[PDB]
């Protein structure tokens, strides 16, 4: 069922199991390409997750023949061949807030305090891997491939991939190769990597398992859930101390829910 | 048959420690009837046996294994009660600020590890859960048996990890999709998946094989210089925490005094 | 042989457009790691950063194998015969010398040309600190790596404690290569991730670490070492801090020809 | 003249002088206390600003008889006596988001690149502490006061006075004795500690000057001083390599002005 | 005298409510720092953070000055007599020393409660150590501060580098009185901000020290603790991560009755 | 007279060095013509300087001044004319790459004094403008004569100030609104208000009496013990860019060397 909170020109969101949400990516015929409209609908549609008691988790997937072709092409020529500004400063300024407002269509991702799951069947190309890399846990279809297309397109990739991708798996090697190269990566070496958790034969298989996982994380405590959530972004981000002390912080007030007893 | 020194400095409840070779310290989780069940005393006990290991001038390296059936089933869920079921305190602030400081002082259990500057390696068979992950993962190296399993529980009994897991089992594997869903469905993970993420460096066919190798693993580290080992453990836990520049300034400041020292002089020497 | 390059330690080359090949050359020594060494380094990375024709380098090893790492005579004279009177002294002079060194593999870190390491034999200690300064790392079968600084009787200083465990992800494992020295052969190097591709042979290996060269080199170099820059500033700076970067540094960097 | 973008019910926003604007709290009959409407109309209204080419400074006053009495606690109430969620943990979920929203009503003016000056007379007290310490410069009247009210009321303050306060003055001795003892400092006293950079004999007065300071700034290059805002802000935070490292990226792109040809 | 409270050279009295007095008491040897001292300092002030009762703490010292600083003759025993062979065992024996004597003043800091320092007289080289590490400083118009280690022989390493600078806004005077060892008095002492009120004399001094310790009482102690963690925190972090901090800590703290 | 060693290592054109009592070393801006305006060779000649001094082991202390009328009027613009009015490079991305090179290679000029051990006094008479704050503010301490001014110029001339201002003036005094209105309208900052606001340490009457006693100052940190006063700078370098428990850890392995010194022993038998 149709999510009621939720209507979008990018996105078709739905109720996949009780606590969980579907967030498909819903422009097939342009293969999930992101137009300006998606940036601006991910913000709004995550947002309105976060503030969801109700969802527990989620699961992202892509319509069509490919989870995303990345950044509509089109749109972005608007935005960087027609750049609003006198100067180069003046320029740079409001290239700045541009990069900066495509960011946050990902970072909303990070901010939702339920976990994220993406599923990726086929292609899933530079924007595709700046979405896939700031949700918590990934799968994917055997014909899945991932792709840091920037440097190909002519710039270093500024909407999160560069920034989450070398902490999302262990070979810094590989991640330098990938992002110099822009080379597809696929699915066996995407699971060799650990850039995703599991491969599956096909997208309908996949897309049973993540909703499967979405449906075990909903079953647990959401306080324990979300807090994991919350505690495990900022131990990334800190020092094992700070991290130790944050949690303890946090705790002290969590420990005090009636899912404990 | 092992017997205790003239003047036995550790003598636990719920730890059992015994001397394994020249330097080596094997540190056994013993309370096997509670499959060796983390309650009041252990983590009392801990703290006290890794500051006494720490400042102990002898041992260059520790082993931590588990007796009887498993490594640990976890906290002991009847004294976790007594703190969470009567906490201290009139209102809410009160109780959390009650709270706030015995997960810190739970959180010692497992920071003495870490602090303790002689390299300690985790020998898990059998179960490892809840609190034993929190525990193996401020340990330097991981080993297990065939049979072992590690397992995040605390999302099953309904909080986050709040004693050391969260903070690193993230830093100490790669993939952070694993890391993420390890976290959050409390599953449990087998030996084989555990050794192709890289939460164990080896698995062995069976615990008493295991043991033995921790064991020589351990030799072989207490057969270097404690001066450079000791050194490199302080170096590799600042390099966790620190960018590049900060750990490469770090390790000169550290590096001035250390290199100091007629253990380079004689290695040196000998390789000369 | 590349003009402007010419060292007593070190071979530079230049045959695929963009791309220079950097070889220690001391095979006769297996490429240890002498004085000279440390200091042309520096003067050969250095220059490689200011080279707006290069866009891509690889490092490799003349002889038999990659290197044995620090000539030890000439690490005796710094450590046995310690300039400085007292022990307070003493240290204020050994701090130099170690920052000094660790400069010979910070300059490959601060050139933003990728730089991609050819390993073929041994790679020893000292070797072991360069290579994780690079940012990709191709090897041949015979190929080993070893954290040798524990046998000689201290903490690994020049690098490696500082970027080994940022390259690979399993903690155990560099722990226990850092606490033992034991060697790591090519296919577990290859299943820990610290590299990414084995090769059955120097000439095999060499030919594909160029050939990688050349696929860098045919993008823009704008954009490619903006990915350096920005990869680098990622691993050291939380995500918050590193997205704000990355949109100060491309606000400038998007108003390119490359791009239009 | 009123500036036409912006319409409120809880400030008034005029063009004061050419490039500049004045936002002047606006509820003199309840002492411009900070009720709900408040929190989310500042918020609007700096990030318009932020993005206003035409505006190169900001001045914040307030009508009526005193700067601001702080938060209103009529509606302070109805947030924190009857919260929403059902047992402790999911009321601390509730009211950190309350916070951080709250905090949001501040940083819009740290966010902000053009330089915001702050005019204080008679009291500046409680959530009024926390609002003139995020801007960048603080002026006030003889007749004015400071005071961190919030540990009367029963709580730290927590919407920006704990963490901004003792980074803008030296005397952290000061900082602390303010801070728990919710005292009041007068206008002799913020100026000798450096809160204030000037004090003026009254109201008149201090808003001229506050004024001409912002239309000197006004005068400068815009690129110059929201470069020097934005980089200031960064070294405030972050080691002096770190800094100087940003600003070396921050004006290889800014250096190409025609402000400085 | 209060209960629980017993030391050689401390003494612990508790007249008003809700207010502890610390005195460091060797007026004998004008409250120079011994070895009992350091390790009574950490007994006594973990005691305090655990009582409930307690709200605000005073620290003065008696006799003649607060402080001559360490009592360099059990100075003498630790560095003329250091334990290990060599200079590097000899170095992480001195490194446990000096962290062990970092704690006697580092749990000031951790006391959740506020502690203000009441000095009269000299207060020397340990003496800003230890206040430097309270929360507020009111000194008598006789006292004076003195950074001595340099003229000692060393840098300070209890805590004097590293709170000095972050308690006063003039570094060009915090450097000034490092390098020289020179004494601040009272006057100069208000002016840089190092202390925020001067008094006539010991007497008045120590009454407004503890007038202040009774206001802070009066307050709700949730509030006031918490106040003091977030104001600790905000001193070592940027301002975003504080604020988040602050989010995180009144989320709970909020929930309190002295509130509602 | 002053005379040259008989093998002078400090021969400038921008820069005159001599040595004014034993262990101190006076740094002169010396292009009193120009009002020692910044040229290409005053960039180049400071690093080259301090670090000769920072290798120095007989220097203790630094005193900063200027020669003629005034410490500086700052960059000089015809120089900074051709870096910025003929940037080399196609494209605003390779301009932007050259720009950000030359700024870091200016920054060094004053990163210089501070990663020098030995303190460093600034003895300011007369304007100190836009580059000059940039210098000063990375000295460890400020004197200047009654007649002195501080000038954050750069926002006049169309830039943030990039080579240090904005990274260490708000470090070295506590009022930001002050800091902040300073750096936005390039006022002029004059001795009295300097002294108030902290940026100097003391004001004295003349450029005569200023720089006697600043050399005093010198002459007393240089009569301190070497290694006490250089490992203070050290370590007041790293409180100023570190939390308090960093920089606590921070100089406890930094004195682990540094306590076994002589200098210890001495000053200790001397007190006793
Ligand atoms: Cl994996
Ligand atoms: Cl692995
Ligand atoms: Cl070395
Ligand atoms: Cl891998
Ligand atoms: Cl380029
Ligand atoms: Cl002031
Ligand atoms: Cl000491
Ligand atoms: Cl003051
Ligand atoms: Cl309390
Ligand atoms: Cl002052």
Chains 1, 4 share one sequence.
Not at 17 to 22: T, Y
Not at 65 to 93: C, E, H, N, Y
Request: charged share 20%; aromatic share 6%; proline share 3%.
């Amino acid at each position: 069922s149709m999510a009621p909170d939720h209507s979008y020109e990018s996105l078709r969101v739905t109720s996949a199991q009780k606590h969980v949400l579907h967030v498909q990516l819903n422009r097939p015929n342009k293969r999930n390409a992101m137009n300006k409209v998606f940036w601006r609908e991910m913000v709004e549609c995550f947002n309105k997750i976060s503030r969801d008691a109700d969802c527990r988790a989620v699961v992202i997937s892509g319509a069509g023949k490919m989870f995303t072709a990345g950044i509509d092409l089109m749109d972005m020529a608007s935005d960087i061949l027609q750049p609003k500004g006198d100067d180069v400063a003046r320029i740079s300024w409001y290239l700045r807030d541009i990069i900066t407002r495509y960011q946050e269509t990902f970072n909303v991702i990070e901010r939702c305090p339920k976990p994220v799951i993406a599923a990726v069947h086929g292609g899933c190309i530079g924007g595709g891997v700046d979405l896939v890399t700031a949700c918590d846990i990934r799968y994917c279809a055997q014909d899945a491939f991932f792709q840091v297309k920037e440097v190909d397109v002519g710039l270093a990739a500024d909407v999160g991939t560069l920034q989450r991708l070398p902490k999302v798996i262990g070979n810094q090697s590989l991640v330098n190769e990938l992002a110099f190269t822009a080379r597809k990566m696929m699915a066996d070496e995407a699971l060799g990597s650990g850039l995703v958790s599991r491969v599956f034969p096909d997208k309908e298989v996949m897309l049973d398992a993540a909703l499967a996982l979405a449906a075990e994380i909903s079953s647990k405590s959401p306080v324990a859930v979300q807090s994991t959530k919350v505690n495990l972004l900022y131990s990334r981000d800190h020092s094992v101390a700070e991290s130790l002390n944050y949690v303890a912080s946090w705790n002290m007030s969590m420990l005090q829910t009636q899912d404990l007893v």
